[PDB]
Design a protein around this ligand. Structure first.
Ligand SMILES: CC(C)(CO)NC(=O)c1cccc(Cl)c1
Lengths: 172, 171
């Protein structure tokens, strides 16, 4: 995946978030530190927060990442789209996991209720474990795909089944 | 402890540590001029070649951090293998491959003998981290059986799509 998409993937709370633009940062609601009152040197009172279930968007009143171009964020993607989930792992290792995207879904995963766009990993027979599949610390990683001219981000990693291929992308 | 630590840059492609002393790769990626590999004189290395499959056995422990894994001659038809691709970018790209019969296949004008496979990414336009490229040769084919990982061969070739592949196998 292009270096300019990896540069946007930022370690955050118990997981990750993603810079859509110099002023817009997206993440999974449950990775946000619940005590936090300051983000990137800005107080809460200078930030517009848009929350839909497991999807959170932060809009800043100054350019926090002026090195970046604004890119397209969409509310999920068409059924059958193949996306990459841009996962960073132990020691500048980059893991762009291939996922075939499905229907909007509500599920119960490890007792928790989760809603977003479902998908199936295309990495192996079963993706149990960290070599072929996701771990809890991957939450907030972006789902991206190429419209063979440009790249689109269509949501953030919310949950995965224990012993399975199924993942959920939280969407705007 | 990870399978990915076993995938190592080698010659024009990659190879895989099966054990502290056993390394497997694709015959055509191996340097044709060498007096040592991994600091060990070629004098003390056993080389077993079968077509596009090569196994090296070293006289001392090169990777003492590793346990020995199961190596088999291919896998049953219908098995969904993972090809463990490493890229010079720093990307790790595990891709699902549905495995078919052992055959001699015509791939970009050459005959290649090994186990056929097709990627589950399928459609085409792999210009997205969705298919193989020539520099990926020697990457291992693995799958989970019970609690056990099995390595069943090495990446030897692919069609122009990068979606129809050949896994070179032992013996
Ligand atoms: C990435 C950092 C170091 C900063 O955002 N993460 C945390 O400080 C963190 C992690 C887990 C839980 C809570 Cl409350 C905070």
């Amino acid at each position: 995946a292009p270096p300019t998409l990896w540069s946007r993937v930022t370690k955050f709370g118990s997981g990750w978030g993603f810079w859509v633009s110099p002023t817009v940062f997206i993440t999974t609601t449950h990775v946000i530190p619940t005590s936090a009152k300051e983000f990137f040197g800005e107080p809460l009172t200078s930030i517009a927060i848009h929350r839909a279930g497991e999807f959170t968007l932060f809009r800043f009143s100054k350019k926090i990442r002026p090195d970046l171009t604004g890119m397209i964020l969409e509310e999920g993607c068409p059924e059958g789209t193949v996306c990459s989930v841009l996962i960073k792992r132990d020691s500048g290792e980059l893991l762009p996991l291939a996922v075939r995207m499905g229907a909007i879904a509500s599920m119960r995963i490890q007792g928790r209720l989760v809603h977003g766009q479902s998908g199936m990993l295309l990495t192996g027979a079963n993706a149990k474990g960290m070599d072929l599949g996701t771990i809890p610390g991957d939450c907030g990683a972006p789902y991206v795909y190429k419209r063979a001219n440009d790249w689109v981000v269509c949501g953030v990693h919310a949950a995965a089944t224990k012993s399975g291929n199924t993942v959920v992308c939280a969407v705007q």
